[PDB]
Amino acid sequence: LDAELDQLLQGHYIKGYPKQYTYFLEDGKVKVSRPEGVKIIPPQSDRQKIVLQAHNLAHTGREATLLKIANLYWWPNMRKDVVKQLGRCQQCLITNASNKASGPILRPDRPQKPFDKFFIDYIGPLPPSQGYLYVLVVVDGMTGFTWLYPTKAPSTSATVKSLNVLTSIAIPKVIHSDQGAAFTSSTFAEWAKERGIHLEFSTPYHPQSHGKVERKNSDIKRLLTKLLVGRPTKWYDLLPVVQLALNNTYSPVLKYTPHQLLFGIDSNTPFANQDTLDLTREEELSLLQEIRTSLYHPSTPPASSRSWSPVVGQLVQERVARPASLRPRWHKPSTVLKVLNPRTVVILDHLGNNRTVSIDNLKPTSHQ
Amino acid sequence: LDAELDQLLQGHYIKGYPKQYTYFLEDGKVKVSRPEGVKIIPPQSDRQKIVLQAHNLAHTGREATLLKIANLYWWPNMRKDVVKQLGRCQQCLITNASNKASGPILRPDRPQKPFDKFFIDYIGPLPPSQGYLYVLVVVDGMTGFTWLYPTKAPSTSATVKSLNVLTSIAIPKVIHSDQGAAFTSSTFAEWAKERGIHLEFSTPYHPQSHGKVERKNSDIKRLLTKLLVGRPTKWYDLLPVVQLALNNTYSPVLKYTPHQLLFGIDSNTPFANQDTLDLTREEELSLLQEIRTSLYHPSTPPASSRSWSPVVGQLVQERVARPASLRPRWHKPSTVLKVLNPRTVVILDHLGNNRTVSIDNLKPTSHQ
Amino acid sequence: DRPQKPFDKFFIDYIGPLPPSQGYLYVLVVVDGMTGFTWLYPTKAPSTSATVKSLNVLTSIAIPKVIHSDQGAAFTSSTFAEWAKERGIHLEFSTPYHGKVERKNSDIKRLLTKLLVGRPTKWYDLLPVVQLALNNTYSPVLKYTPHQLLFGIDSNTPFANQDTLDLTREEELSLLQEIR
Amino acid sequence: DRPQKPFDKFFIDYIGPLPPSQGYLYVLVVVDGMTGFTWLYPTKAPSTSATVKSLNVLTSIAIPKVIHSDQGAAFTSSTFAEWAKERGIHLEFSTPYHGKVERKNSDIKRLLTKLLVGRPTKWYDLLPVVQLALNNTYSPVLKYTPHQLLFGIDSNTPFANQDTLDLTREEELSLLQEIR
DNA sequence: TGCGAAATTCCATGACA
DNA sequence: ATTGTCATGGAATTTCGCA
DNA sequence: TGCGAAATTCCATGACA
DNA sequence: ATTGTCATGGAATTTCGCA
């Protein structure tokens, strides 16, 4: 404060204030003659308030805030005081965008067997067709084999009815889905437990986590579209055709159709593959077990040059899921409890609840 | 047809059919013994129909279509016949996604003077405030200096009232905007012509073309948000504050505020720059002319590895602007009349109208 | 002669009338010849219409080369013939009035009867578990369940409790009270 | 003494009452001292409230260091004083009852009177062009228009037709019919 | 043991609300 | 207390037919 | 004529419906 | 018959204070 600035005026040396400059009093204020011109050196006790005034004009970041201040003032290490303030501006922290990308995606192992894991989701609402509005899409993780069910609503009960029809064929170990109301209801949990099925949920608002089914939605809509060109959008009668069509389509990277991966032999559909005509079923199932283990598996891509990865104890902010107009896009800062993997974390949200959350719905809080 | 396949059976050589394979009759069909097994060679006259059957199962692209066919058939140059068919499938062409990126963006020269070009746009609807729902945002191209006007609707008449208040200060040579109803109405054109103002329109649904104002919208909403944190969204009284705040904020790459670029001297606002205190106004305006010509100008970035660029006479498809559910995302193919620049073209749309269109709303039609 | 495979031949047949359950009265039974895998479909009648509606569901998962049945009206109609022709399915009929499949069909009737006692009306809901039981039931002849033969893997519902399948003295007298 | 600059001093004053136009009666006149640039605002009254409402628009574009006015009630009120203090504007008053600005103010009154004849009621709409005329009018003393001095560029509306500014014999007699 | 062309593989692009 | 995916069609690379 | 640290510049990231 | 932009805050690079 006034003490430090006194020593300064009478020629003494203070750490941070370069001795090679001429410091003086004028208009009752300590000034200095810097290459860019004469600036006021406010007392340390004044500085916080100045930075705040500068920042608050437009809630500007580091440089734009500094440039305002530098117009009138100089003191040692200005930006440190700027950054200190930015880190304490709740409005800036919850409103600004991130400028760091997530670390590279994980490519989890393909489930080992058919029926190990189902990925499920709803598409819709679609145009009304026979009074139906939605599609339940069920994708077997290992095979890509897909089941389609039309529904009137994306509800637990319609999910339960459909899954009862499906699970007539086989029961899966795990069913994985997003946190839609249909899948998180206790009624659905009882239905799962009753049958030995473990429910696994994606982190909230991160449909990539169950990307298999999401990607199949795309193909389903794409084929429905092509088939409905120039007709009214009567899709109900097309569901079965699309199911069969997609289950018997080749993935060019795999060289197999989901049907082939499920059964190891084409059924009586057009252009059925005849290669195993002379094998016994047992020989065929043996070649199948082999084909299933040797399928192409993609690898984790290179990180972008400015990615960030979560560290226990770090301050991070969850993305607001459905931000209202003129409201912040980010929640208040929270703390990383556990790093489950480099792309998923548990945070404590200031309330404080535990939330398991995708890195893609997080930014690291700026300025520590 | 049956002629070609006759010569083949009696050991003769036909171009395309490798002589080193054993060709025979069986079940009344010409077969061949290929490393992958025995395939039928259909007669040339049968082939188109086969490819079509294969493709139509799921409207599959090249490889997935080929893999179906190869199950039962072989003939020379199968994929050529596949590609021929894909190029003729209207449903595939108007529904599939592009897999080629646009060429790199242009960075047009900054307008040379204040008032050479205005970029204008509406933000909204926002939450009601004093009965207002929209903001007219006017951005001077050279300075970034911005004017904000609250409106009840994004209409010509509200635009006209606002621009009359603004053009009291100065008249611009050009006003550039998107093709919103407010700006394309004949009433607005008469208003422009009356005052010597040329109206310039961005290509449809390409807000990057007038990116200056779009980017300013972001800052406007961002600052409004910060200011409204924890209060009800009463933004009307904040417009003037935001205007002033933004016009006096530094662009860190420029080292100037839009106000400085407009006037060459700060008004009586907090942290006013004092550097030209000793210059005469005339000296100040001289330094200003100089600052205006030496502003950083960004350069066109490197092209992505799989970009495409338009060529006169090429078949291309305009993106459907507001595709209904289960309807194609692309219009029928059209023809490039003129290449205005590597990022903008005139097309003839089969109706056939002339349309000036952004490359970003185009894909090149596949398989020629 | 090439070896027998799944989807080579589906054996279909109707069971019923049964006591009403959710308005349904019959069961369409489909057994794959080679694997012995069973699919069941509740119908309101043993008609060609009900058969087509049911097999349309099945044939959106797998299409048989051949369907085999007795000369039931539902199967010998020209509508059913047209339906099959559209899908490239050959129809096959056993001569009027006269292995693996025959045994499976017996198991189904017997398994059904054991469960429609004390609840002759709740069978609609039981169909899924009936099927799972049937398809995860060990075959004495081959070393494998139908599940294993269709999918080439073990099931997550192994039915290791090979159940009586016989009527207990409680059910024998409770079944003769049902007819009364 | 540092040289005179834009925003150093705004000279404000009211003109009116005028004949009603869109319910407005007065004009708040703001002239920048250094550039001679003029901003005009239609008001319903020469009150502190109307002044604040008007200057709030102007001060969202540019804030003067000093406002100068006569001792009009609207300007000497403590509300106006508070308003100025909030914005860090020093208020300045000429003594009661007694260059570039004075001339500009004369031009405004004269230009206004020349246009409110034959249409004494359409002036609200004419304000924009009045201002553009005023600000693209050549200054005899300096070589430059107010536009040029404020923005450091030529204008896209140069008023090369330096108009009479005087009343023609048609308007002189048409103005003495207006008062009658 | 090397050529021209066909086949196959590679892989950026974009879309799943 | 969890996790992207994969059809697509030009381009790049490999293999084929022949010698 | 070179060190450590501060200042400045660089620039990927994301959002404008 | 037209065309992306630019605040942001860590990182990279340059300049400063001193010797």
Ligand SMILES: CCN1C[C@H](C)n2c(c(O)c3c(=O)n(Cc4ccc(F)c(Cl)c4)nc(C(=O)NC)c32)C1=O
């Ligand atoms: C209510 C529970 N709930 C949460 C959110 C609404 N959600 C749910 C979905 O099924 C989807 C969905 O399919 N896509 C499409 C999409 C977008 C980008 C991608 F990378 C991928 Cl793989 C998929 N987006 C969202 C979403 O989060 N939008 C912001 C979404 C859902 O059911």
Ligand SMILES: CCN1C[C@H](C)n2c(c(O)c3c(=O)n(Cc4ccc(F)c(Cl)c4)nc(C(=O)NC)c32)C1=O
């Ligand atoms: C009706 C006339 N019309 C056409 C479309 C509706 N449009 C209009 C707008 O003002 C915007 C707009 O601000 N943004 C936001 C945006 C998105 C990406 C960017 F790169 C940038 Cl620079 C801006 N998007 C669209 C749009 O085209 N959405 C699909 C848009 C407009 O008025």
Ligand SMILES: [Mg+2]
């Ligand atoms: Mg969902």
Ligand SMILES: [Mg+2]
């Ligand atoms: Mg989804």
Ligand SMILES: [Mg+2]
């Ligand atoms: Mg717009």
Ligand SMILES: [Mg+2]
């Ligand atoms: Mg816009």
Ligand SMILES: [Mg+2]
């Ligand atoms: Mg029978």
Ligand SMILES: [Mg+2]
């Ligand atoms: Mg007066």
Ligand SMILES: [N+]
């Ligand atoms: N994993």
Ligand SMILES: [N+]
């Ligand atoms: N340009």
Ligand SMILES: [Zn+2]
């Ligand atoms: Zn802030």
Ligand SMILES: [Zn+2]
């Ligand atoms: Zn097609």
